[PDB]
Structure 1
């Protein structure tokens, strides 16, 4: 049945209708606005709850599944596609934001390498490492926030080891195969509550807006992000698919319409993963051998929409703060945005938590994420669509390159 998609679409229209009517005909205070958004807050807790189980077991399962003999090349072909498309999205975003103009870096760069290799695996599950220079001597502290970057590196390295251990490591492959299946089943349970949670998430965001003048202030910023997301989705990604796979890229995209439409409502690449599998494997007839690796791994590692949005958002905030941006500052933004997209989880608002790392890399407060938080719900919806579209296209791109091994 179509209840999953029809109900989710009905949640979005009811959230906008609920949010606009409540905003106009009611005078909710700050506390009442927070309580009104509570049902959507609980959905965020449910989605953040499965972030760690899903990311860890997805990375281990995908890499471990790849047969060591030759499927490793299939894995390498994917990471090159993931990195190339994210760089293109980041570069495209910086060009658009710099052209349109809508509005201590070493320590931050070194913190990205430190977080790739956490000192503790349990601590990396809910804490991150930050260094500051004080007197100058570097002082490091562990602050809250799951270190997704460190877990990804270990989970991929762990998946590589157990996959290559043959029968000695089969129990670990069986363990994380079942764990990955269980996490996806739990995500399906959360989809029963998502229509209600999404209703108050969209409604709550609209109610928070005060006078609609900020939307006018942020209108050009949204155009830059929406223009970049449109260019990457409609021009760049189809162009890459056509070159590698001499097939109509837009016919391939039509087969993903349910997944793309699902992502445009729930704003979660991990939550829409089951739809991406169904669309890629059945509508597009992509091999399940490579789909079972590209999609679950790319649901969090390949985020072109987030990477573009992080670069545009960071440069836009810098423009607002009247902060000059040299070639060096632009380059660190590109690196930080690329890592921020990797560290972002396939959940609504993931892009905001990782933007603090991008803002700090150029010396900006972590509280400047509230200069663009008003319209994040809309821009987050389109981020996810491009994030999952990248994985879907990469699924067909990797399959073409892996004809010899399949």
Structure 2
């Protein structure tokens, strides 16, 4: 038992040791800023490794999942997945707005058009490391390219390419085999990185509990943390199991239990795209879900799901707006929540989406950007919980989509 799953127990022990080391160093030592930065180097190296493997994995896996489906049945499955994700996103948005209004812890047109612009990039190679942005200037619109991987356009192109090569028949079989092999190789490289994972995680946690200086941020942010945690808990325990039970007449909690390893891996590494191998294995072997449904549904959810964004980034934006004593109407609150939810779409995949996404959402909404440092402190913990919620939602969606496509999966088998 210990040898079979030594990675998970070693990671848990590393987390505990990192928390203890961070507390002890903070209490019994006086480190300068430079030494505090040098103390977290292994965690930065681990994050660089994790970011290095996101692109090829997502691209190859998405293409493989699209091409594995028959041409005449892929539309209905995609429609079901889209409907499920839309319903979950809407419910999450409503819950987040209601909670942020009740607890009170405290141009959007260009930002909405930039999403469509980034859906269709002007260069395929440039989209791998750069993104497009526009702003008003004296009024005319001026656009430019800045650093940051454009995963939305890559996803769209991957979907189109997979659909095209899955219909060519024998003319596209070489591409199908090439991308299948590439996906397998990337999955093995991810497994290789998972061996170095725990040592980086230890220093990441130790250095996270070190940068806190005054500790009064915990006093000021108590209600904001309570709001985000309550929203995530309600979404995880009430809404998703009920939807699964409504569609699938089976015990939702047994299904959630069967994905415990994937959930804990997502909670530890704080990334959904890099948890894909564990998610695949748990869904296929523990829950007896069809491979064809899983390999197509999970890659889309690992990059598109926005149930946690609407419950974290939108709540943070509303909290920041409330901090400045700004008077907000019921229409304005909805505007901010939708803008924040839509602005960040690849947050689940990023190992620390919050650090880069907070300033992007604040700039898109048009609020003072100097208040980001107040909320960055608890991002390392709220973001990891959000990652667990997103992975659980993706697994539930995979199960639901498998349940609904019963005749399609039996017609797809008689053909072969």
**TM-score interval, smaller chain:** over 0.9
Which is further off, 346-355 or 274-283?
346-355
The separation in 1 between residues aligned to 2:42 and 2:214, in whole angstroms, is 24
Assess, with a 3 A threshold, how the Cα gap between structure 1 residues 327 and 160 changes in structure 2: closer, same or farther.
farther
1:373 positional shift: 0.8
The separation in 2 between residues aligned to 1:393 and 1:117, in whole angstroms, is 30
1:402 positional shift: 0.6
Q: What does 1:242-391 correspond to in 2, within 5 Å? A: 242-391=245-394
The separation in 2 between residues aligned to 1:390 and 1:303, in whole angstroms, is 10
1:357 positional shift: 3.4
Which is further off, 4-13 or 361-370?
361-370
Secondary structure of the equivalent of 2:143? strand
- Structure 2 contact 344–361 (Cα < 8 Å) conserved: no
- Structure 2 contact 354–376 (Cα < 8 Å) conserved: no
Where does the alignment leave 5 or more consecutive residues of structure 1 unmatched?
A: none
Secondary structure of the equivalent of 1:128? strand
Secondary structure of the equivalent of 1:369? helix
Which is further off, 200-209 or 292-301?
292-301
The separation in 1 between residues aligned to 2:373 and 2:71, in whole angstroms, is 46
- Structure 1 contact 15–200 (Cα < 8 Å) conserved: yes
Assess, with a 3 A threshold, how the Cα gap between structure 1 residues 17 and 177 changes in structure 2: closer, same or farther.
same
Secondary structure of the equivalent of 2:134? strand
The separation in 1 between residues aligned to 2:119 and 2:367, in whole angstroms, is 23
Assess, with a 3 A threshold, how the Cα gap between structure 1 residues 54 and 87 changes in structure 2: closer, same or farther.
farther
Per-residue displacement from partner, 1:285-311 (whole Å, max 9, x unpaired)? 111121111122222222422332111
1:54 positional shift: 2.0
- Structure 1 contact 109–361 (Cα < 8 Å) conserved: no
Where does the alignment leave 5 or more consecutive residues of structure 2 unmatched?
A: 410-416
Alignment equivalent of 2:171, drawn from 168, 172, 175: 168
The separation in 2 between residues aligned to 1:215 and 1:327, in whole angstroms, is 29
Q: What does 1:96-175 correspond to in 2, within 5 Å? A: 96-175=99-178
1:137 positional shift: 0.9
Assess, with a 3 A threshold, how the Cα gap between structure 1 residues 160 and 356 changes in structure 2: closer, same or farther.
farther
Assess, with a 3 A threshold, how the Cα gap between structure 1 residues 382 and 10 changes in structure 2: closer, same or farther.
same
- Structure 1 contact 66–72 (Cα < 8 Å) conserved: no
Per-residue displacement from partner, 1:189-223 (whole Å, max 9, x unpaired)? 11111101111111111100012110121111111
Assess, with a 3 A threshold, how the Cα gap between structure 1 residues 8 and 341 changes in structure 2: closer, same or farther.
farther
Secondary structure of the equivalent of 2:272? coil
TM-score when scaled to structure 2? 0.93
Assess, with a 3 A threshold, how the Cα gap between structure 1 residues 91 and 102 changes in structure 2: closer, same or farther.
same
The separation in 2 between residues aligned to 1:85 and 1:139, in whole angstroms, is 35
1:165 positional shift: 2.2
The separation in 1 between residues aligned to 2:64 and 2:148, in whole angstroms, is 24
- Structure 1 contact 333–358 (Cα < 8 Å) conserved: no
Per-residue displacement from partner, 1:114-137 (whole Å, max 9, x unpaired)? 111111111111111111111111
**CA RMSD after TM alignment:** 1.7
Assess, with a 3 A threshold, how the Cα gap between structure 1 residues 6 and 88 changes in structure 2: closer, same or farther.
same
Q: How many residues get paired?
A: 406
Tell me the residue number matched to 1:4. Answer: 7
- Structure 1 contact 263–272 (Cα < 8 Å) conserved: yes
1:341 positional shift: 4.6
1:147 positional shift: 1.2
Assess, with a 3 A threshold, how the Cα gap between structure 1 residues 355 and 336 changes in structure 2: closer, same or farther.
farther
Assess, with a 3 A threshold, how the Cα gap between structure 1 residues 119 and 338 changes in structure 2: closer, same or farther.
same
Secondary structure of the equivalent of 1:121? coil
- Structure 2 contact 58–273 (Cα < 8 Å) conserved: no
**Greater Cα radius of gyration, structure 1 or 2:** 2
